Design a protein around this ligand. Structure first.
Ligand code: HEA
Ligand code: HEA
Ligand SMILES: CCCCCCCCCCCCCCCCCCCC(=O)O[C@H](COC(=O)CCCCCCCCCCCCCC)COP(=O)(O)OCCN
Ligand SMILES: CCCCCCCCCCCCCCCCCCCC(=O)O[C@H](COC(=O)CCCCCCCCCCCCCC)COP(=O)(O)OCCN
Ligand SMILES: CCCCCCCCCCCCCCCCCCCC(=O)O[C@H](COC(=O)CCCCCCCCCCCCCC)COP(=O)(O)OCCN
Ligand code: CUA
Ligand SMILES: [Cu+2]
Ligand SMILES: [Zn+2]
Lengths: 48, 58, 535, 269, 236, 63, 353, 75, 117
């Protein structure tokens, strides 16, 4: 089964949910966590 | 038989069809408490690091 | 069960490099959004986004330092390019201690959790990246934040030590039949010379951090001056780690550039023995200087004169490497593909960022530049434009071989030009702000420093767009990547010569100087059954 | 390579490890140890029986590694001449790293011994702290260490002349000659006049001679697994790498103790 | 002095030490500009001439004379740089007779100035504390985050020795025009020396990080004549 | 020839977007009271009476 | 101030052993290898009288310039006579530099406790030259340090000839004293064995890893036992040092492999370090107790006793190795080094005058 | 006419933390003997009042009055 | 698990390399306790046969297409690195001979053929 889509941990083709959703959610979480941290520490210290 | 079971266990660890860490009929006694208590040790430090972010102390 | 025994319980060295890449991408996204938070606050005078909180500004700066000194550049330059390429270049099947490679990967996700949990249970850890003793005590930071942040610098230290011992032990006795240790490629020498500094530097950091912990929580008073200690000792015990560290980030970059300069300009490298001796000299003279970070603490007058002399000497070996790269690029034929664009943008910007280091080396001139934005502008031209550019060049060089899927050339060029323009807009007026007198680590500034802060907030929004375009380049590589090899001739590793016909070239396509580009391109799981032969 | 049936055996002398689960479990134990020690020291947990589970699970994880290291060498039989050289180079590069932790602690001693501050009236061992006399129990420990360095040479030179009773007795005598060191040094920590918090002097004296304590519990364990693996016939007269690593580890600790006795216990003025 | 809005270069000097710093920087920039122009011209020649070329000189890979020329020529530059650096390091300091001493102790988020001389028989030492003026209480024309309520007033043409320490954490005394940047660590005294040649106002800011109120801790130095200093010292 | 135009007009529409994003964070600013022309003209008189920047220039006016 | 003198002396001893030992990477061979040591042995007593006349700083930089011009004449020399002349001038420069530098460290650091620490740091340059790529970084680092030294000594403050205020004792008066000679004999007989071991080691038996542990141990030994020799008494350190040198020398004939020499070599180098840093300060102590304080000729005698081993070593060692052999030579030098060690107890309290 | 401490070449460095302590100890040594009103023991008084911060002197005086003081004041 | 070998002429796998046993009260010898790829080296070195070769490439004669250099392998491919006929003239160029095609070394010109054993 050695081939061009065999060394990757995630499945890319012949998949039920298309690959755009797992590709987008990875970057969405990666650029959304450090705004959540700032929101929590702002709300714990009085300011809006 | 004698203390030279070395020439007997070397015909067992070869041709086993199981992994090395679970091949002998003694590895149950080592592997059941370890994996049992590890799932409590990890599940206790994910409850006290989420309770503590909300300000709750003991 | 086959998923678990092959991507969680692993032995293969090349299958941990892909996990290192996936981790490094995430930990380089988080810090870049944290940097965008900082640069959107330092835009105009006043209190704009963080309402009045000067905490959650220092926390963001600390967590942006740690996530890209320890969690992005080192996992990419050690895990993805060192674990994958070094066995294939020296000709070995796998590493010597494979389970230590697996633990050196898996110590890092527990190090991310403690750092992200050092910014939610309390005010936070706003001590800066250098966790100085009398601020990080129990009178300013009294909570489980600094403690959980100095436990994230232990696990990374253990991982780096265990990786370095593996790298040194592998290259000594796991070579092929006809390689002595003078026919090795230059990347293996770069990994060896960074792995020796990882042995010789990390115990001092571990000792200093542990003594800081004992001062905080077991009332020991190593660094408290009410019991007979000095804070300055910690500075020694920090910076003896600090200056080896910043060569650990840059030596694996250099060798990568050499390969690109050897490839897309069809000439061998000018003076390879001089290059390995130059890397050895740079590695040795990074341990005998550490106190140029501390000229204002009150040292002697005969000790500053030693550290000005021992700092400017390091310019002599680096010039040999730069001029040898110019001599390699001089005579040959040059085709401008997307690795050589990043290669050409590295030989100019490392020089500009490194010539500022000679101005800061003098103890007389450091009185005007210490804790000032000139230092920040100095080390961002070398960190963001010297290491990240080498990482992008290495990715665009070795990704078709590892993955087997090609990429669109035009979008990669647009990404490169956006990075170039935005990053040169961002870090250049920091020199002017430094020369006029703006200090470091301040949220709010006097109204005179406004205008340049309006311009350096504009390039960051250019660079984030380049990161998003890089994400789309990866997506276009993974989907329909088999059909992206006939669009452009960039997919060819080497071009036909003048006399070499096309019919002859299609029979004999790959000409190389390493084992790397002659493999089948997915590399096989067990890639060497019979040994390789070198004369 | 032109031996007749050569295809049926491996063509390069290196060890391909089978798939093992222990790297993940060590990391999951260190996660719990780091977070529990960060939390119990500032409230938030209260009960001190989670830290002890974390340390116990870490030590059992190393023991469960070393089992699969032993079975792959005395039963499967994959340790050629090259792999043994790799293991020796590896252990030397951990002994070297464990030396350089003591260098920073020695440099934390000479940065205060030569040049003390003004808060302490400028004097080593300062006023009100009575030091430990070096003509008492710190002589007994030194002579016990020099004897234990001599007894293991009678154990490594009796496995090469094929005398079994003469390898077991020497290892037994060495194992009882390291337990007495720990027993003496735990009695010198209960009959002292100064604690970890009583100066910069009481804080560096219990931090260079306390790491040595942890490093010498490891020799008691490593010598128990070297007596027990010799009693059950695992050691041949030319293939024993468990003894060679325990001998190199003991001698480095003896030389380190001879520098913890002239700098810490004798030199005070 | 005061910072200027679109600044490119240094602030103006009032001390010989800062003039030596400026002269040494302008001496180093000569050689750095020469090296950068040489490297840029070589890359321009490489791009303009040897791009997509038919002939590859793949046997010019050794060199023997040219590797000495890029090893000895940077060394001569380092010796020429190292001569005035050592002269400026050793020469310009308090060689002869300082004439005053001001102790500038750094507390948490303000400054404490003691003029240690002018002592009465009972210990009537003149002392004050300098704070920052808030934005709400500023008058018309004052500089935000730099203007204080009490300023250090010194004469002109007089050697002044500053002894800097701290009581809480590590601070850093800075007046950019005067060329003074020394730490303030909580268990030791540090010294600097300044000579001021012209009257005016000199502004400065703290450097080493101390906590939340790091950006509000200014330093302001006025340089009056001797008669005004005597009239000011008989009022405080 | 039809690819360099694509790269050029891809970089231009990468610079235009960031300018429109940065403009939106420029109208909605907290402007303190000191950043007005009638306040930076009162500072020049104080910097003129106490002689400051004799050699180069002093000017705090940037509207 | 005072530390730049320590830097100058450290670099002077480093260049001494670098130009002495490192000649091959950078009978006729017996005479050519020992050409430097004998001419240094002859011209050492003259500089001790010269420093009392013209002062300390000028012979140091004169020796540096003489060493530089002699090395650059040795660089392109082909004939035998000019090569012998070039190595003779190399030796006569290296004889001025070390003697005047050690005398000026003796002169500036008057306190007895600091002198041992500073000379323990300064003697560590005798092994860095044995350990020591391109080497052009290190030469320009040295050139920068000596530029700093020249700026402070000759530029900022004027320097005249300025002879010393007091007149020192002559060389024969120093040679009539028993204590200075018996202190010098310890250094001589300690260094004699390690001088003779080097040529006979290719005969008995890659090259750098045999000599590396002594260079590792020497720095640690001198930098530790420079400080701690004040409380322990210097005579006891000398006695223990000679004992350990003797035992580690007898340990070599029982070794039958190249890797078995690593452990005794440490036991050589550390031990000879504890011979040196203990005994070289105390000579400068003795003149402060019994004579008038001029430190030139005494450290000239000390350098004579240091260089006697390297002068006599290979020429006699080859003859003994051809005559009897390696293990009996090691046995006789070890018994001599052990037998000398009882009589170093006599330096506990010399009679003051 | 604005006169302060000169050079004092036994302490030539940038750390003046030993000059303060030595001046304080020397003043109290020469005031234990030779009376309290004597002329050269006001050179030391002006010496440590010109370098030392005041809080250090107050803490040292309280530590002296409680009997609890690490120093060599007993000659 | 089966009949034990005495020389390496009777070794048809890992099934012939277990060996006899030691006796009670004796430090065992390596000819009485060794199983895997360790005993195979042991039975090679007591005869003179080196199982794991460390001899480099032939650097004597060039390569013609009629008379090529024969490289021996147990696979269909083997990586061969050419560096010259006087053994250091040619730089390092790597080649992959195959059972269907011969490599030819674009700079100096030696031809390599694969011998399948
Ligand atoms: C990224 C890795 C990196 C690199 C490559 C360097 C390179 C150098 N750094 Fe380091 N440095 C840092 C890491 C790094 N540094 C960091 C992170 C900081 C910030 C500190 C922080 O706050 O924690 C810092 C800051 C810093 C300072 C300022 C410390 C302070 O704030 O006061 C100094 C000053 O001595 C210094 C020294 C040097 C020198 C001399 C070089 C030189 O190696 C540069 C060499 C480059 C060349 C010289 C180009 C060669 C070209 C030639 C053709 C040679 C021509 C010859 C001549 C110029 C004579 N660095
Ligand atoms: C690791 C090196 C590094 C990097 C990459 C960056 C990135 C950036 N840094 Fe720098 N910065 C530091 C070094 C670095 N910085 C350090 C050490 C500090 C702390 C100083 C202190 O604590 O005192 C600091 C802090 C710091 C500050 C805060 C200053 C302070 O508070 O005093 C600022 C603000 O202007 C700034 C600027 C920027 C900007 C705009 C970027 C932008 O470039 C961010 C955008 C990022 C990208 C352009 C690259 C994205 C990378 C990837 C996604 C590629 C992944 C790679 C592979 C695929 C192989 N940095
Ligand atoms: C302290 C952290 C560093 C200690 C590690 C020292 C390991 C030295 C021994 C060694 O190198 O062997 C490896 C690990 O063995 C071991 O000794 C396993 C030790 C693992 C400790 C992990 C750190 C926990 C803290 C072999 O490992 P291998 O299985 O790849 O050998 C595969 C072939 N037999
Ligand atoms: C975290 C703590 C440090 C972790 C590292 C532990 C020490 C490094 C172990 C070095 C072992 C090297 C090695 O591979 O030796 C094997 C023996 O393993 C062994 O059995 C060595 C025993 C190691 C036990 C380590 C106990 C330390 C834990 C104490 C923590 C407190 C060889 O086996 P072989 O080839 O010699 O067999 C001969 C067959 N005939
Ligand atoms: C600072 C300098 C930085 C230089 C930056 C790099 C510039 C491009 C260099 C390109 C490499 C040139 C090169 O390797 O060729 C050399 C030509 O020598 C030369 O062109 C230099 C010769 C130097 C002449 C010095 C003046 C001599 C006349 C004196 C009159 C009195 C020797 O070529 P090769 O011999 O290695 O070819 C070997 C046969 N494969
Ligand atoms: Cu206060 Cu800085
Ligand atoms: Cu640095
Ligand atoms: Zn060829």
């Amino acid at each position: 089964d050695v081939g061009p889509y065999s060394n990757l941990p995630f499945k890319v083709k012949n998949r039920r949910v298309p690959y755009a959703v797992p590709h987008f959610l990875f970057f969405a979480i990666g650029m959304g966590i450090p705004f959540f941290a700032c929101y929590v520490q702002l709300k714990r210290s009085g300011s809006i | 038989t004698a203390t030279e079971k070395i020439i007997e266990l070397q015909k067992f660890y070869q041709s086993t069809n199981k992994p090395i860490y679970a091949a002998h009929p003694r590895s149950k006694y080592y592997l059941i408490p370890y994996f049992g208590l590890l799932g409590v040790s990890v599940a206790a430090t994910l409850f006290y690091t989420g309770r503590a972010c909300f300000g709750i102390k003991d | 069960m086959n998923y678990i025994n092959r991507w969680l319980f692993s032995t293969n060295a090349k299958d941990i490099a892909v996990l290192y890449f996936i981790f490094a991408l995430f930990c380089g996204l988080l810090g870049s959004i944290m940097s965008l938070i900082l640069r959107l606050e330092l835009s105009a005078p006043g209190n704009q986004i963080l309402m009045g909180n000067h905490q959650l500004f220092n926390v963001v700066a600390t967590a942006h330092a740690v996530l890209m000194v320890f969690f992005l550049v080192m996992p990419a330059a050690i895990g993805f390019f060192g674990n994958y390429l070094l066995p294939l270049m020296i000709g070995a099947s796998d590493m010597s201690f494979a389970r230590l490679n697996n633990i050196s990967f898996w110590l890092l996700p527990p190090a991310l959790v403690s750092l992200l949990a050092s910014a939610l249970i309390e005010n936070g850890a706003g001590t800066g990246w250098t966790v100085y003793p009398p601020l990080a005590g129990v009178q300013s930071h009294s909570g489980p934040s600094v403690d959980l942040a100095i436990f994230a610098l232990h696990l990374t230290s253990i991982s780096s030590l265990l990786g370095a011992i593996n790298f040194i032990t592998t290259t000594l006795n796991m070579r092929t039949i006809g390689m002595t240790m003078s026919k090795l490629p230059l990347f293996v020498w770069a990994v060896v010379f960074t792995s020796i500094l990882l042995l010789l530097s990390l115990p001092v950091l571990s000792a200093g951090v542990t003594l800081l912990l004992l001062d905080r929580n077991f009332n020991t008073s190593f660094f408290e001056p009410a019991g007979g200690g000095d804070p300055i000792l910690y500075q020694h015990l920090f910076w003896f780690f600090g200056h080896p560290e910043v060569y650990i980030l840059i030596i694996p970059g250099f060798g990568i550039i050499s390969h690109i300069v050897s490839t897309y300009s069809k000439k061998p490298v000018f003076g390879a023995i001089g290059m390995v001796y130059a890397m050895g000299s740079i590695g040795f003279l990074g341990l005998l200087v550490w106190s140029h970070h501390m000229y204002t603490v009150g040292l002697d007058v005969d000790s500053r004169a030693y550290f000005t002399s021992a700092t400017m000497v390091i310019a002599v070996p680096t010039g040999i490497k730069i001029f040898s790269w110019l001599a390699t690029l001089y005579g040959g034929s040059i085709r401008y593909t997307t690795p050589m664009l990043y290669a050409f943008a590295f030989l100019f910007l490392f020089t500009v960022g490194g010539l500022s280091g000679v101005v800061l080396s003098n103890a007389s001139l450091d009185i005007a530049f210490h804790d000032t934005y000139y230092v920040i502008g100095h080390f961002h031209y070398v960190l963001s434009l010297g290491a990240v550019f080498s990482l992008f060049a290495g990715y665009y060089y070795w990704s078709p071989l590892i993955t087997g899927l090609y990429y669109n050339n035009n979008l990669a060029n647009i990404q490169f030009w956006l990075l170039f323009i935005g990053t040169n807009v961002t870090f250049f007026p920091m020199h002017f702000l430094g020369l006029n007198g703006m200090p470091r680590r301040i949220p709010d500034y006097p109204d005179a420093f406004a205008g340049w802060n309006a311009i350096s907030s504009f390039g960051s929004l250019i660079s984030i767009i380049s990161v998003i375009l890089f994400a789309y380049v990866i997506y276009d590589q993974l989907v329909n990547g088999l059909t992206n090899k006939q669009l452009s001739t960039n997919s060819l590793f080497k071009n036909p010569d003048f006399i070499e016909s096309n019919i002859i070239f299609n029979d004999n396509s790959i000409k190389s100087s390493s084992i790397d580009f002659l493999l089948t391109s997915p590399p096989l799981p067990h890639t060497f059954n019979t040994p390789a032969i070198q004369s | 390579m032109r031996i007749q049936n050569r295809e049926n055996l491996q063509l390069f002398p290196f060890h391909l490890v089978t798939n093992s689960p222990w790297p993940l479990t060590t990391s999951l134990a260190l996660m719990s140890l780091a977070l529990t020690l960060g939390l119990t020291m500032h409230g938030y947990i209260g009960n001190h029986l989670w830290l002890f589970l974390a340390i116990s699970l870490v030590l059992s994880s190393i023991f469960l590694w070393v089992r699969d290291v032993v079975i792959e060498g005395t039963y499967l039989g994959d340790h050629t001449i090259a792999v043994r050289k790799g293991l020796n180079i590896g252990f030397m590069l951990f002994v070297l790293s464990e030396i350089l932790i003591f260098a920073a602690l020695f440099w934390s001693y000479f940065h205060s011994a030569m040049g003390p501050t003004i808060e302490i009236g400028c004097q080593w061992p300062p006023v009100g702290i009575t030091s430990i006399k070096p003509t008492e129990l710190p002589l007994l420990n030194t002579i016990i260490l020099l004897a234990s360095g001599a007894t293991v040479t009678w154990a490594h030179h009796s496995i090469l002349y094929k005398d079994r009773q003469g390898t077991l007795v020497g290892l037994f005598i060495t194992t009882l000659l390291i337990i007495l060191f720990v027993g003496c040094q735990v009695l010198e920590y209960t009959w002292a006049t100064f604690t970890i918090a009583d100066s910069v002097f009481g804080s560096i004296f219990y931090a260079g001679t306390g790491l040595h304590f942890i490093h010498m519990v490891m020799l008691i364990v490593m010598l128990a697994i070297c007596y027990a693996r010799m009693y059950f016939y695992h050691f041949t007269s030319n293939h024993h790498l468990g003894l060679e690593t325990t001998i190199l580890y003991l001698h480095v600790l003896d030389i380190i103790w001879l520098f913890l006795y002239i700098v810490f216990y004798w030199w005070g003025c | 002095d005061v910072p200027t809005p679109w600044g490119i270069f240094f602030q103006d000097s009032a001390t010989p030490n800062m003039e030596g710093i400026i002269e040494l920087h302008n001496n180093i920039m000569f050689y750095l500009v020469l090296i950068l122009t040489f490297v840029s011209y070589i890359l321009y020649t490489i791009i303009y001439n040897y791009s997509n070329a038919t002939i590859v000189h793949k046997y010019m890979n050794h060199g023997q004379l040219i590797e000495i020329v890029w090893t000895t020529l940077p060394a001569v530059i380092l010796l020429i740089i190292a001569f005035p650096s050592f002269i400026l390091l050793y020469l310009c300091d308090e060689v002869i007779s300082p004439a005053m001493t001001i102790k500038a102790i750094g507390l948490q988020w303000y400054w404490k100035y003691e003029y240690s001389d002018f002592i009465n028989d009972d210990g009537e030492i003149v002392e004050f504390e300098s704070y920052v003026i808030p934005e709400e209480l500023l008058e018309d024309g004052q500089l935000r985050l730099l203007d204080v309520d009490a300023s250090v007033v010194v004469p002109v043409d007089t050697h002044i020795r500053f002894i800097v320490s701290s009581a809480d954490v590590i601070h850093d005394f800075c007046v950019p025009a005067l060329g003074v940047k020394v730490d303030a660590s909580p268990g030791r005294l540090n010294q600097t020396s300044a000579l001021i040649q012209r009257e005016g106002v000199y502004y400065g800011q703290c450097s080493e990080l101390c906590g939340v109120m790091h950006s509000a801790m200014p330093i302001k130095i006025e340089a009056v004549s001797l008669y005004e200093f005597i009239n000011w010292l008989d009022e405080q | 020839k039809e690819d360099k135009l694509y790269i050029f007009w891809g970089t231009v529409i990468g610079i235009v977007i960031s300018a429109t994003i940065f403009g939106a964070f420029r109208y909605n600013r907290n402007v303190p009271k000191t950043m007005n022309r009638e306040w930076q003209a009162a500072s020049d008189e104080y910097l003129k009476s106490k002689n400051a920047e004799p050699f180069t220039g002093y000017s705090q006016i940037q509207s | 101030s005072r530390k730049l003198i320590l830097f100058i002396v450290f670099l002077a001893l480093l260049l001494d052993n670098m130009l002495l030992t490192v000649v091959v990477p950078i009978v006729q061979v017996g005479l050519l290898f020992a050409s430097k040591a004998t001419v240094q042995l002859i011209t050492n007593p003259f500089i001790g009288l010269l420093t009392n006349r013209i002062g300390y700083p000028i012979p140091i930089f004169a020796g540096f310039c003489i060493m530089f011009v002699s090395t650059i004449m040795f660089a392109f020399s082909s004939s035998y006579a000019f090569l012998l002349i070039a190595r003779s001038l190399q030796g006569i420069g290296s004889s001025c530099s070390s003697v005047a530098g050690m005398g000026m460290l003796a002169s500036v650091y008057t306190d007895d406790e600091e002198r041992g620490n500073v000379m323990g740091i300064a003697l560590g340059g005798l092994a860095m030259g044995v350990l020591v790529g391109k080497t052009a970084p290190f030469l320009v680092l040295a050139a920068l340090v000596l530029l700093d030294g020249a700026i402070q000594l000759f530029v900022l403050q004027p320097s005249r000839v300025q002879p010393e205020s007091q007149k020192g004792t002559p060389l024969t008066t120093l040679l009539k004293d028993p204590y200075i000679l018996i202190a010098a004999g310890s250094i001589c007989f300690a260094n004699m064995g390690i001088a003779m071991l080097e040529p006979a080691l290719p005969i008995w038996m890659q090259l750098g890893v045999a000599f590396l542990p002594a260079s590792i141990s020497y720095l640690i030994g001198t930098n530790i036992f420079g400080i701690l020799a004040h409380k322990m008494g210097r005579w006891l350190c000398a006695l223990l040092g000679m004992i350990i040198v003797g035992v580690s020398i007898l340990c070599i004939p029982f070794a039958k492999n190249i890797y078995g020499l690593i452990a005794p070599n440490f036991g050589v180098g550390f031990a000879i370090g504890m011979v040196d840093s203990s005994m070289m300060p105390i000579m400068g102590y003795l003149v402060d107790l019994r004579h008038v304080s001029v430190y030139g000729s005494v450290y000239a005698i000390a350098d004579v006793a240091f260089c006697m081993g390297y002068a006599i070593g290979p020429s006699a060692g080859g003859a003994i190795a051809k005559a009897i052999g390696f293990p009996w030579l090691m046995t006789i030098i070890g018994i001599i080094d052990i037998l000398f060690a009882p009589l170093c107890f006599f330096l506990r309290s010399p009679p003051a005058k | 006419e604005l006169k302060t401490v000169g050079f004092d070449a036994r302490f030539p460095q940038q750390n003046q933390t030993k000059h303060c302590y030595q001046s304080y100890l020397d003043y109290h040594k020469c005031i234990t003997v030779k009376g309290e009103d004597f002329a050269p023991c006001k050179v030391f008084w002006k010496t440590y009042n010109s370098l030392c911060p005041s809080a250090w002197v107050e803490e040292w005086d309280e530590q002296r009055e409680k009997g609890i003081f690490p120093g060599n004041l007993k000659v | 698990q089966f009949k034990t070998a005495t020389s390496i002429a009777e070794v048809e796998g890992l099934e012939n390399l277990v060996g006899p046993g030691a006796k009670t009260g004796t430090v065992p010898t390596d000819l009485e306790q060794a199983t895997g790829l360790e005993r195979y080296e042991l039975l090679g070195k007591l005869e003179g046969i080196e199982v794991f070769d460390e001899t480099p490439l032939e650097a004597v004669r060039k390569g013609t297409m009629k008379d090529p250099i024969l490289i021996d392998s147990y696979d269909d491919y083997r990586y061969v690195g050419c560096t010259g006929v006087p053994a250091d003239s040619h730089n390092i160029e790597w080649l992959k001979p195959t059972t269907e095609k011969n490599a030819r070394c674009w700079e100096c010109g030696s031809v390599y053929k694969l011998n399948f054993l």
